[PDB]
Design a protein around this ligand. Structure first.
Ligand SMILES: [Ca+2]
Ligand SMILES: [Ca+2]
Lengths: 213, 220
């Protein structure tokens, strides 16, 4: 768990602000919010959010039972956490939430799935709530994509990781279907979200926010 | 520690420390502007618009110690601090003028600016972008590291509140803090659009941290 967090820090050159900004803007008018964490993985984003809202309810969704198993141990004995092994793109959510949040997961969906997930997220928020996606975004042109990737590879190659850990992470990134940030902000606006904004951006890493009011 | 020949200068150092106390994302704000400032020559011609005490230029000289710099500012006092910052260095020019109205005749590899353009009226912003395009060399780049307005009242309040928090805990005197609480800031997309309108390509927001954004465009 610690080992999974410390490794993640080595692929994410803006780790502290990336997760710190996502937590800072995650404010709702309940100190007991119901939070849905899409592609929760080992539950790192939900953990940062639990520091801010210790009495929140969390629903972690992930295809990986293994990741979720790490999350359950991370959250040992916390009865306010629910775990669902499923593809959150396909899952029929029937509860309503104060927050729908995600880190580094939505860029793996086909573009049509992204668009529809943004749309569906609006409908499963309570009559009030927020959406936060801290995710990878594609360069606006091929030159900007190359710029973003060059800087990120420089960081990864110098993060302390071995040649084989570097190459393995590069292999994992071949399934990415990232798209331009602005196109994703447009899909949130088109879904009905207001106060739509990119709050944080560091080359390909962006924290995107919307509010249902 | 710079890896180039600098002359120590007490005054410009003190101004640098205070700016870091007003800017919560200081390292990355300036760090990113320098990462993206890449052109082929090792002696680029760089224009610094609203250069102040020369801080953005000094960061850029780390990466390009033999570049030629032209600092433009309405303030002679700011510019004098810059001259003493770059004491000796023979390749810095200083011009006291409103960079938004001055007739630039040379061409540059880079037009850069930090925290200054948001003080211009919108029509002057729009027009500065058009004209910066004109005075750039082929493959030249435009960088503006600046304040942007929140997209809505709610996001504006979020940005301000975060900043005010930092600023009350960063070590600034209650004077300095109030000596800072002028702005015609506007939303980021509108500025990106204005760069595209002036002819820039590869227009992108490279970095953003609430109201602080580093915007980029290139002439090709
Ligand atoms: Ca299974
Ligand atoms: Ca004068």
């Amino acid at each position: 768990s610690g080992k999974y967090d410390e490794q993640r820090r080595k692929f994410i050159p803006c780790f502290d602000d990336f997760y710190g900004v996502s937590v800072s803007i995650a404010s709702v008018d309940t100190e007991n919010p119901d939070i849905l964490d899409l592609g929760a993985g080992t539950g790192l984003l939900s953990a940062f959010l639990m520091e801010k809202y210790p009495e929140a309810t969390f629903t972690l969704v992930d295809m990986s039972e293994k990741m979720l198993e790490i999350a359950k141990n991370r959250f040992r004995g916390n009865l306010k956490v629910k775990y669902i092994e499923a593809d959150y793109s396909k899952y029929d959510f029937e509860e309503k939430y104060d927050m729908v949040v995600s880190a580094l997961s939505i860029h793996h969906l086909e573009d049509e799935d992204k668009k529809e997930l943004y749309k569906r997220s609006y409908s499963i928020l309570k009559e009030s709530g927020i959406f936060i996606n801290a995710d990878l975004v594609h360069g606006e042109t091929a030159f900007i994509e190359n710029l973003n990737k060059t800087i990120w590879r420089q960081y990864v190659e110098n993060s302390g990781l071995t040649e084989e850990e570097i190459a393995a992470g590069y292999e994992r990134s071949k399934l990415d279907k990232d798209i331009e940030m602005n196109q994703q902000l447009n899909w949130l606006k088109e879904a009905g979200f207001r106060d739509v904004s990119c709050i944080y951006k560091y080359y390909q890493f962006a924290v995107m926010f919307g509010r249902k009011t």
